[PDB]
Amino acid sequence: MHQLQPRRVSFRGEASETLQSPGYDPSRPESFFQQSFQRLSRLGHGSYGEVFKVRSKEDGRLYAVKRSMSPFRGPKDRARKLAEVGSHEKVGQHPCCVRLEQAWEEGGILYLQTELCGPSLQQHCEAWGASLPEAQVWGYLRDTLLALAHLHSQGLVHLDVKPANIFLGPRGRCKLGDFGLLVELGTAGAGEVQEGDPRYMAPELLQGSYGTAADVFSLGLTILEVACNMELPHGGEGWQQLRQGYLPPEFTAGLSSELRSVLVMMLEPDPKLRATAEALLALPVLRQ
Numbered sequence: 608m609h610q611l612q613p614r615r616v617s618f619r620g621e622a623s624e625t626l627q628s629p630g631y632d633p634s635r636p637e638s639f640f641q642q643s644f645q646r647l648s649r650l651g652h653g654s655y656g657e658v659f660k661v662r663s664k665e666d667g668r669l670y671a672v673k674r675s676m677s678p679f680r681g682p683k684d685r686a687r688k689l690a691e692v693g694s695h696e697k698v699g700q701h702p703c704c705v706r707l708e709q710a711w712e713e714g715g716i717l718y719l720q721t722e723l724c725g726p727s728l729q730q731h732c733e734a735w736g737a738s739l740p741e742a743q744v745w746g747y748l749r750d751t752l753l754a755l756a757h758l759h760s761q762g763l764v765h766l767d768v769k770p771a772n773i774f775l776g777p778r779g780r781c782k783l784g785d786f787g788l789l790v791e792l793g794t795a796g797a798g799e800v801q802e803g804d805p806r807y808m809a810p811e812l813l814q815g816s817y818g819t820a821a822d823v824f825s826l827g828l829t830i831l832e833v834a835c836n837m838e839l840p841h842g843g844e845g846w847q848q849l850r851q852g853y854l855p856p857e858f859t860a861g862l863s864s865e866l867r868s869v870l871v872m873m874l875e876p877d878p879k880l881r882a883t884a885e886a887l888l889a890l891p892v893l894r895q
């Protein structure tokens with residue numbers, strides 16, 4: 608038995624370049640990941656695999672690397688996992704999007720290497736233990752809207768906007784990440800489209816319908832959650848009322864009229880009436 612060398616995963620159609628790094632010798636049994644990075648800590652894990660903080664031997668910089676758990680079960684499993692790279696490449700470089708440095712597969716395992724960001728917005732709020740100060744909220748709302756405008760004007764829908772998928776950066780900035788469910792509208796692959804976390808899901812998705820507006824609604828609930836320190840319902844009347852243009856006055860009494868107004872625009876039940884990211888970013892309140 609002999610082993611295939613690791614190989615880059617990319618959908619850009621560029622000439623197939625074969626992997627190299629200081630510290631890496633392809634005749635050794637250790638994986639490219641093992642040889643090419645100093646593993647520093649584990650940032651996260653799940654049925655998908657694990658995310659590590661690492662230092663690159665290529666450039667001495669810190670990165671995050673996501674490593675799948677177990678080898679591909681078959682060709683379609685492999686295709687579905689590799690498509691995350693293709694989605695992520697469609698996002699390109701944007702200051703409010705988590706940047707993909709490179710991706711590769713080895714031994715049936717997929718690796719995605721991104722810039723290292725701060726903690727997720729979920730983690731931050733959990734630590735904070737209270738509603739975020741509204742000044743913070745506005746800044747996160749703006750940055751995540753900038754990410755969505757960037758996606759949407761290219762016909763891309765993220766479909767899983769939520770605090771766990773937004774990462775902090777210095778000076779109150781943040782970046783949208785996790786493009787594993789992102790779809791390009793009106794091209795091939797409509798068959799492989801799947802809704803995101805049901806806690807944050809837009810109402811139209813209940814009937815199977817989606818579009819860029821679904822992200823605006825999910826981001827609305829994201830901002831509601833962090834601005835009010837509210838536990839979003841998983842279902843029932845509470846879940847349904849949030850999809851019918853209603854806000855619980857209890858958790859939301861503290862909000863400014865301006866932020867309340869903006870959330871109502873974002874949570875509009877009819878996707879055809881719902882505000883676009885572009886229209887929101889043009890509001891004077893998001894152009895300070």
Ligand SMILES: Cc1nc(Nc2ncc(C(=O)Nc3c(C)cccc3Cl)s2)cc(N2CCN(CCO)CC2)n1
Nearest residue numbers: 650651671672673705719721722723724725726784785
């Ligand atoms: C969960 C978590 N991630 C952090 N930074 C990240 N950067 C990028 C991440 C990421 O997942 N990239 C990615 C990949 C790799 C593939 C596809 C898609 C994407 Cl988006 S996760 C920081 C953090 N902290 C933990 C606690 N603190 C340490 C001291 O205690 C502070 C920092 N925790």
Ligand SMILES: [Cl-]
Nearest residue numbers: 638640641674
């Ligand atoms: Cl490995």
Ligand SMILES: [Cl-]
Nearest residue numbers: 681682683684
């Ligand atoms: Cl398969």
